[PDB]
Symmetry: C3
């Protein structure tokens, strides 16, 4: 279970949907994400693209980070401004994609990947304290504290 | 100590300050960050927003990465262009926020989160080497090496 | 092996190249990257800057993430829109840098860092399964799986 992922398909079986998150090969860090629908992102535009899938099970100690693909960033003048997926998120992954071109539109197509997903190890903090420190004496005052 | 964090409050107790860093849900991988002061980020503007807090103690094997919130990115046409917090950083966390709108200003308000902070596991490299590969033999030549 | 990195220098010894990747302080989580050549990034421009180095060996369970430098971002109105370095990449690291200024050009200079590189712990997925879950009853149907 330590290195296993379960993706949740939103569309009922039998219905046309996006290509599933596909391992990027050659390579080992990313999954390619695909769009459910086709569109053209206008110059300076910001799009929210549905991928047809959610993460049902994350690998242990990992959350998901949606990142831009190098090719499209350079070729289509794009970026992925946000992409932090919490371990409790059950909804459908949606890629936020910005077109930085003042002249060209970005083609979003069924069989072509729009972004990558990486499973990064993070710390799920168990203990937290908020402290105020006297800048002259070094004396500490606990503001508040909590356990998870 | 392995999963514990200590935040340092810059404002004395009883003084006006930003809401403290806080995880919104039990599935939250990131702490929500809040502004100390209210402002309006002009179109195309880049702001450095004070959060009222610093990190006094990091969890073991982790560093702080400030990332954009999805809501704030989509609703206000924003991005967080930088946010690497080194384990030796002793100052107040400041969020760098870009407003991509050519027409609308971004409202920065006291009770509304501007970004989030993740504690990511990184490798604190102990041994490093620069190598040159001889192009006739394939023989590796150590240029330099260092220990931490 | 667990906490060791090997950088590969592309330029021959004796030839002038970029300053090597280096951590600024003992508290640095990232290596400062430097450019092989000098250039000026025009307003609204997107540049692909060669660093003179590649990663020959990654630390165990790590990949390379190129991220923006704080002073460089705030001072020169820049960003690093991409920077995922897969563990199988042996080529030269190239920093993708966007100039957001509509008026000022960005000076790229030999001794000045353009970005930084972090070695982040990731999961190299061994098993993947795509499943359809009924909302009625939590009944699961494996659509596809791979190892």
């Amino acid at each position: 279970s330590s290195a296993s992922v379960v993706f949740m398909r939103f569309a009922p079986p039998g219905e046309e949907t996006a290509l599933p998150p596909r391992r990027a090969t050659p390579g080992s860090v990313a999954y390619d994400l695909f769009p459910s629908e086709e569109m053209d992102i206008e110059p300076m535009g910001l799009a929210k693209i549905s991928t047809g899938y959610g993460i049902d099970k994350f690998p242990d100690g990992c959350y998901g980070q949606i990142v831009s693909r190098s090719g499209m960033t350079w070729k289509n003048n794009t970026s992925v401004p946000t992409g932090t997926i919490d371990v409790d998120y059950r909804g459908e992954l949606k890629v936020i994609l910005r077109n930085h071109s003042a002249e060209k539109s970005v083609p979003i197509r069924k069989g072509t990947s729009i972004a990558q997903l990486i499973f990064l190890r993070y710390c799920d903090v168990e203990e937290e304290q908020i402290v105020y420190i006297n800048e002259t004496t070094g004396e500490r005052t606990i503001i508040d504290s909590s356990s998870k």
